[PDB]
Amino acid sequence: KPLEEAFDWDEYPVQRVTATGYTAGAESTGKNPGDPLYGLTYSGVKVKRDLYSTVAADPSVFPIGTILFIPNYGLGVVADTGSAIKGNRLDLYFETVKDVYNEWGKKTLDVYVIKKGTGKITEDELEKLNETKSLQVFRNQYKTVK
Amino acid sequence: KPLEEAFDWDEYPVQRVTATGYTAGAESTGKNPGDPLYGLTYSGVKVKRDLYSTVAADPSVFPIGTILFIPNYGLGVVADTGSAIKGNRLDLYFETVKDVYNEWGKKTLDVYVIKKGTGKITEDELEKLNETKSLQVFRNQYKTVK
Ligand SMILES: CC(=O)N[C@@H]1[C@@H](O)[C@H](O)[C@@H](CO)O[C@H]1O
Ligand SMILES: CC(=O)N[C@@H]1[C@@H](O)[C@H](O)[C@@H](CO)O[C@H]1O
Ligand SMILES: C[C@@H](O)CO[C@@H](C)CO[C@@H](C)CO
């Protein structure tokens, strides 16, 4: 039986947060494996994924040592910080980048099938779709470059 | 308007899928910058985040060239494949790992505050938490090692 179902968690105080995953790797921490500080959180404990996992928070909201229950992740102990983790934000530790993508990022949803493909697509065809005139009004919401 | 609001998308066929994000990088693709095929999808087109972005699918479900609308991502053209991308699965291209974490992975949710911290946590404390006797029954769901 899941821990989510094993207690009446709504008896505890609740905080709405925005949560992402992170790993010890350089994408997240700037550190490389081989650095003696690799895996070391702000609190001084090493990152861990277990029954109680290390998470990052803003210590002004959740002090270091705070225990949280995060549905679909598990029990967390606030052990780390981050420059983007301010306010009602959490970063949940996962061992690998793929684990973040798969265990936190995977979402079931409906998508709409606009046109079935033929089995091939060219650069020119992709460019022409991107230049669709009637849709240019929407486009700057999707490009990364200003 | 958001594109999500601009058209009656429910007039199109719909498919329920499970979707994740990916990048061109090695964690997703096994390739590194400098590799001849770096940034190139199965179809041969370069990865792209734009009005119409390149996505990965199982060609048995969505042939290459299929146009999709994916809420909270955008229009997609099926251009890529992947080893785990089987059945009703999509992988959505993002330029960077952080963009996957932040633009696909970020979830707003309620978390439960079990115990406010004191400002410190030690390895021994974390170990004690993880050894909690009454919670051992749940613990194997959170460890990666069998
Ligand atoms: C696991 C890890 O390296 N965590 C680091 C932590 O050491 C540092 O104090 C904090 C500063 O914001 O940035 C985190 O990414
Ligand atoms: C952008 C990118 O490199 N995509 C690759 C693609 O080249 C390869 O054909 C396919 C095999 O499943 O794996 C994808 O990750
Ligand atoms: C953007 C990143 O995926 C790098 O892309 C490789 C294919 C280099 O792109 C070509 C357009 C260089 O002429």
Numbering used by the authors:
A (entry chain A), B (entry chain B): 72 to 217
What does the paper say about this structure?
However, a dormant state in Firmicutes can be recapitulated in the laboratory. This paper describes the first structure of a group of peptidoglycan cleaving enzymes from Firmicutes, called stationary phase survival proteins (Sps), that are involved in survival in the stationary phase and are analogous to the resuscitation promoting factors (Rpfs) from Actinobacteria. In this paper we present three high-resolution crystal structures of YuiC, an Sps protein from B. subtilis. The overall fold of each domain of the symmetric dimer consists of a mixed direction six stranded double psi beta barrel surround by five helices. In all the structures, the final two helices and the last strand of the beta barrel of each half are supplied by the other chain in the dimer.
